[PDB]
Design a protein around this ligand. Structure first.
Ligand SMILES: Cc1c(C)c2c(c(C)c1O)CC[C@](C)(COc1ccc(C[C@H]3SC(=O)NC3=O)cc1)O2
Ligand SMILES: [Zn+2]
Length: 258
């Protein structure tokens, strides 16, 4: 009986195995656009993905992860609210059963169809496992997806999903360029938070882009054909793999823009 997104093991249950679920800096949150503070001291984000080396795509039973070589400074996030250099290790999505839900963060209580997370770790901690134990260990760049025109840079991801339908399946996934998933603007909100899945560690500086990307209905429909289950288990469609908004508590969301 392990955690997941069902009635019996979903987000409302996670606190029993992971009591920090009720902690002081949990993610995601609702971004109240009118109460976010413009912070003119916030620097532009520096996204350096020109040398990114994708390796593999994995269905881990919760989402699919596109994994990168993080053994060198190849794909790094710097600037914005960050001190030092954060190395890209993986990206994944959260999405809904319907276009009207799927994102983890909300904007004035608006849910997007999906949310992309680009996960980076602070190089001063040496390895991802050490970074997650630190309050400034991770930087996650979150990007909303809305349904409209196709995202050409997403199609290579969509097209490999048939090969990783079930939990524990992986496929080679080299030469994928994550710059093709970015919107035009790097305007962002930022706040201190957590992993949005168990173990829910409070180690993340969240950077959520204001501008969504558009994906086609056909692209997100292919996400919804994935399975939570393993091969030869009863089929459970991988949909609604999002944690709902958690209390903001004693935090202030800062905007990079007016
Ligand atoms: C004891 C121990 C723990 C608890 C440990 C790790 C190691 C090496 C450990 O020895 C590393 C990964 C991990 C198992 C958890 O790391 C994760 C990082 C990110 C995620 C994805 C979350 S965060 C996000 O933006 N959205 C997600 O779904 C899940 C797990 O934590
Ligand atoms: Zn995530």
């Amino acid at each position: 009986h392990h955690w997941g997104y069902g009635k019996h093991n979903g987000p409302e249950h996670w606190h029993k195995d992971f009591p920090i679920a009720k902690g002081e800096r949990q993610s995601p949150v609702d971004i109240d656009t009118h109460t976010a503070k413009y912070d003119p001291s916030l620097k532009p984000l520096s996204v350096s993905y020109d040398q990114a080396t994708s390796l593999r795509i994995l269905n881990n039973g919760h989402a699919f992860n596109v994994e990168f070589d993080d053994s060198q400074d190849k794909a790094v996030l710097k600037g914005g609210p960050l001190d030092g250099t954060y190395r890209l290790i993986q990206f994944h999505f959260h999405w809904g059963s319907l276009d009207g839900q799927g994102s983890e963060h909300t904007v004035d209580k608006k849910k997007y169809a999906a949310e992309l997370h680009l996960v980076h770790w602070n190089t001063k901690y040496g390895d991802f496992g050490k970074a997650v134990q630190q309050p400034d260990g991770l930087a996650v760049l979150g990007i909303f997806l809305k349904v409209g025109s196709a995202k050409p840079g997403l199609q290579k991801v969509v097209d490999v999903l048939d090969s990783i339908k079930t939990k524990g399946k992986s496929a080679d996934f080299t030469n994928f360029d994550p710059r093709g998933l970015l919107p035009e603007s790097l305007d962002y909100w930022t706040y201190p938070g957590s992993l949005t899945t168990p173990p829910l560690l409070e180690c993340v500086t969240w950077i959520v882009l204001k501008e969504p990307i558009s994906v086609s209905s056909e692209q997100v429909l292919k996400f919804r054909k994935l399975n939570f289950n393993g091969e030869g288990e009863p089929e459970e469609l991988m949909v609604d793999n999002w944690r709902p908004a958690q209390p903001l508590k004693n935090r202030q969301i800062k905007a990079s823009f007016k």
